[PDB]
């Protein structure tokens, strides 16, 4: 009587949104960027290899200084490497050896990690006692934490496998603003440069944009045909790129509320695990699971180059804040710095 | 050597960290990692109670014959399995527990599919998974006595219509074991070790130790180029 009416109303709204998006597609990003000189071949070499892990590396995150990066591996260790000297600054033992995320705080005082234990553990790097202590174990998620990101030293956003994203108060240790709306498992979230909005790519083939103080989903982005595994904002903050299991990267723009262009190749039939943008936003480095990472031009579908040198699936890669290096962490226990 | 004193001390600290990491890796490499993947509640707790101890994921630590073990009751995840099942790639074996009493019961959530058929489907899904091609499976068929009394009082044709054997416990158990083992499409790179356990059984740990030693010996022989 009413459930069918509600479903019909939802379908009519969905068609209305689809009609509205089409009216805004006067041109395409590929058509506009036709008269632009291609970036050409990008020959990035493995400058410095970071060895010492003994298991599969599932996540890494650079620091603000663009010199220190953290690495999370299945062996229960969290090494803070010094990329300039290939030095292990810290080795953090973990109570849970199953980790899927690790985040470096902008100030460098704290690092986070999480995984199948369903707890985000915040570790205090610089203190007295000369050790790294578990500052806070954030609990409340009912699923594995796929990705966590620091807003500041006290607020952290976490995505988990309960189809829910959460915003935490580290000092209080209590979930502050739950983010509901996803249908499948949330696999990755990225924070905007202004730390105001964040987009989470879930296993429902959709990426949703959220507002921090409001908890509402401003707008949802669809177009993928498989599970979204990676996500990353444009440096501007008005667009983001998603990585899925269908060998496809899609650049969604927030203001037009639709997809700009698709980075797909017929040769590639694997999935995509990690996606990041360069400092200028022209190159989209996507970490595929066919032992390779592909450097995609953001404005043109052409592939600039391929980052080869990993003997297993590439699981995590991110560009430094100054854009001077790319560090790809793969399933084989090695991190490679590329420039 | 074109390095400052603090740089040299940082290199020394990195070397000490690497030494500690190597020690931890040597300690962990001598431990056996097992993944517990029982279907629902098909006697998944009786086995861990029998093995003793010496939140989404549960780790059970027990030592037998000076060998450390690592069981991971990951059934309390309630998420999409294939998004985290590759974390367990490289475990020595998978301990799959199936209750033989489920051949009469029907899943409450569905009320249509037999519980043992659901267990068979889960076994098929996990045995042929790409991440677990070379990982042996230790099959546990619990509820031996309750299945005994059922098969004495009730027939097995409810769960397996294409059954020709008698109602004796031995033939029924053999049929269930061969039906479960037939689901293994990797007859060459995998082995299934099957044991029938009850509530009072105490040789389950010894059976698991034998199976894990067999798996490790086969892996070592393959690694050393002898197979």
């Amino acid at each position: 009587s009413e459930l069918d009416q509600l479903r019909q109303e939802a379908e009519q709204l969905k068609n209305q949104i689809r009609d509205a998006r089409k009216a805004c597609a006067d041109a395409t990003l590929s058509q506009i960027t036709n008269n632009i000189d291609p970036v050409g071949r990008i020959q990035m070499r493995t400058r410095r290899t970071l060895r010492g892990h003994l298991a599969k590396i599932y996540a890494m995150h650079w620091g603000t200084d663009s010199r220190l990066l953290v690495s999370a591996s299945q062996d229960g260790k969290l090494i803070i490497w010094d990329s300039y000297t290939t030095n292990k600054v810290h080795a953090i033992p973990l109570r849970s050896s199953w980790v899927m995320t690790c985040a470096y705080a902008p100030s460098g005082n704290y690092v986070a990690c999480g995984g199948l234990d369903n707890i985000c553990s915040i570790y205090n790097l610089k203190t007295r006692e000369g050790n790294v202590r578990v500052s806070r174990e954030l609990a409340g998620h009912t699923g594995y934490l796929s990705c966590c990101r620091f807003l500041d030293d006290n607020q952290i956003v976490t995505s988990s496998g309960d189809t829910t994203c959460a915003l935490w108060d580290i000092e209080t240790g209590q979930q502050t603003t739950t983010f509901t709306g996803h249908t499948g498992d949330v696999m990755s979230l990225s924070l905007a440069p202004d730390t105001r909005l964040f987009v989470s790519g879930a296993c429902d083939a959709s990426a949703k944009l959220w507002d921090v103080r409001e908890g509402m989903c401003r707008q949802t982005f669809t177009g993928h045909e498989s599970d979204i595994n990676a996500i990353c904002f444009f440096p501007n903050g008005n667009a983001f790129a998603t990585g899925s299991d269908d060998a496809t990267c899609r650049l969604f723009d927030l203001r037009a509320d639709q997809e700009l262009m698709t980075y797909s190749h017929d040769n590639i039939i694997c999935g995509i695990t990690s996606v990041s943008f360069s400092k200028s936003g022209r190159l989209l480095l996507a970490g595929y699971d066919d032992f390779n990472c592909n450097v995609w031009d953001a404005l043109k579908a052409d592939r600039a180059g391929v980052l080869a040198g990993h003997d297993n699936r590439v699981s995590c890669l991110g560009v430094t804040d100054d854009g001077m290096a790319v560090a790809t962490g793969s399933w084989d226990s090695f991190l490679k710095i590329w420039n | 050597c074109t390095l400052s004193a603090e740089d040299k001390a940082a290199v020394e600290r990195s070397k000490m960290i690497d030494r500690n990491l190597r020690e931890d890796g040597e300690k962990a490499a001598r431990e056996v990692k097992l993944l517990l993947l029982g279907a629902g509640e098909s006697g998944k707790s009786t086995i861990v109670k029998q093995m003793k101890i010496i939140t989404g994921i549960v780790e059970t630590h027990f030592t037998f014959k000076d060998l450390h073990f690592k069981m991971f009751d990951v059934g309390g995840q309630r998420s999409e399995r294939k998004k985290w099942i590759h974390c367990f790639e490289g475990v020595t074996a998978i301990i799959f527990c199936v209750a033989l009493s489920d051949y009469d019961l029907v899943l409450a959530e569905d009320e249509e599919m037999n519980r043992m058929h659901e267990s068979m489907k889960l076994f098929d899904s996990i045995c042929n998974n790409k991440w677990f091609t070379d990982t042996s499976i230790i099959l546990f068929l619990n509820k031996k006595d309750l299945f005994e009394e059922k098969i004495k009082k009730s027939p097995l044709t409810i769960c397996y219509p294409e059954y020709a054997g008698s109602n004796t416990y031995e033939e029924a158990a053999a049929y269930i074991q061969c039906q479960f083992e037939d689901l293994n499409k990797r007859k060459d790179t995998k082995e299934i070790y099957t044991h029938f356990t009850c509530a009072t059984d105490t040789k389950n740990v010894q059976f698991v130790f034998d199976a894990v030693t067999d798996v490790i010996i086969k892996n070592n022989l393959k690694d050393c180029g002898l197979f």
């Epitope: 006692e129 000369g130 050790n131 | 400052s4 004193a5 603090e6 020394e12 600290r13 000490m16």
Partner: single-chain antibody
Framework: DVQLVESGGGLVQPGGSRKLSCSAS????????MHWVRQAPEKGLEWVAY????????YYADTVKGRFTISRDDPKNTLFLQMTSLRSEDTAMYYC??????????????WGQGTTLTVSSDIVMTQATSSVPVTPGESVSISCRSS???????????LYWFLQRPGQSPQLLIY???NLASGVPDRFSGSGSGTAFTLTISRLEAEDVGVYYC?????????FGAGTKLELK
């Protein structure tokens, strides 16, 4: 809290042998490299010895090389300095110094309390200002010079600023310059040009008086300049 209680000093006849023990509590002694710093009854600070984590690298001053030995016991959380054939030049206050070395670390961040002992090619660090009078609320500028440039090829210039209040152990103010120690206020600031270095305090209080020591960590042995005494008017 973090503390370093050191004892084992007293009246020693010349030519004797007495060892110093430094008990470490409230921090991970194993991961910290420990130093011994001397202080004559009326003279400046002088580096003595240093033992790293795991005793991998051990360094001595030229005046104590082959004569003193330094060792640590990590399980007992203690530091040792066995001194042999003590002379009249060793009568001083010996300080237990805590140091760590990673990227962004703060070496020499914590000091002991002193051990009263009495006996019956190197970079030269200079501070011209022996005494400086000042009133509270003003601004000072303590100047220290080096005989060799302390700006290494890696961009890190190795100079450390310490403050010794009357009757208290030295406290780290500013490690490799333009870096503020964890705990000291924002009044202190340091700058330099490879050879000439300065420390500036914006506003002075009654607790900022004392003697300021500049130290170099570019290469062993570590050298302390003669301190600049700050006295109220």
């Amino acid at each position: 809290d973090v503390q370093l209680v050191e004892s084992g000093g007293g009246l020693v006849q010349p030519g004797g042998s007495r060892k110093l023990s430094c008990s470490a509590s409230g921090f991970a002694f194993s991961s910290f490299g420990m130093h011994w710093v001397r202080q004559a009854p009326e003279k400046g600070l002088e580096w003595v010895a240093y033992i790293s984590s795991g005793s991998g690298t051990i360094y001595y001053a030229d005046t104590v090389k082959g004569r003193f030995t330094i060792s640590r016991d990590d399980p007992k959380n203690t530091l040792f300095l066995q001194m042999t054939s003590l002379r009249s030049e060793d009568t001083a206050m010996y300080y237990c110094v805590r140091s760590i070395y990673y990227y962004g670390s703060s070496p020499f961040d914590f000091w002991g309390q002193g051990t009263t002992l009495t006996v019956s090619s190197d970079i030269v660090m200079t501070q011209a200002t022996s005494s400086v009078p000042v009133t509270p609320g003003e601004s000072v500028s303590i100047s220290c010079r080096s005989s060799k440039s302390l700006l290494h090829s890696n961009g890190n210039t190795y100079l450390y600023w310490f403050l010794q209040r009357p009757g208290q152990s030295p406290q780290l103010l500013i490690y490799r310059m333009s870096n503020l120690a964890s705990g000291v206020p924002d009044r202190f600031s340091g700058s330099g040009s490879g050879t000439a270095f300065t420390l500036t305090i914006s506003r002075l209080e009654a607790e900022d008086v004392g003697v300021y020591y500049c130290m170099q960590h570019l290469e062993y042995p570590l050298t302390f300049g003669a301190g600049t005494k700050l006295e109220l008017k």
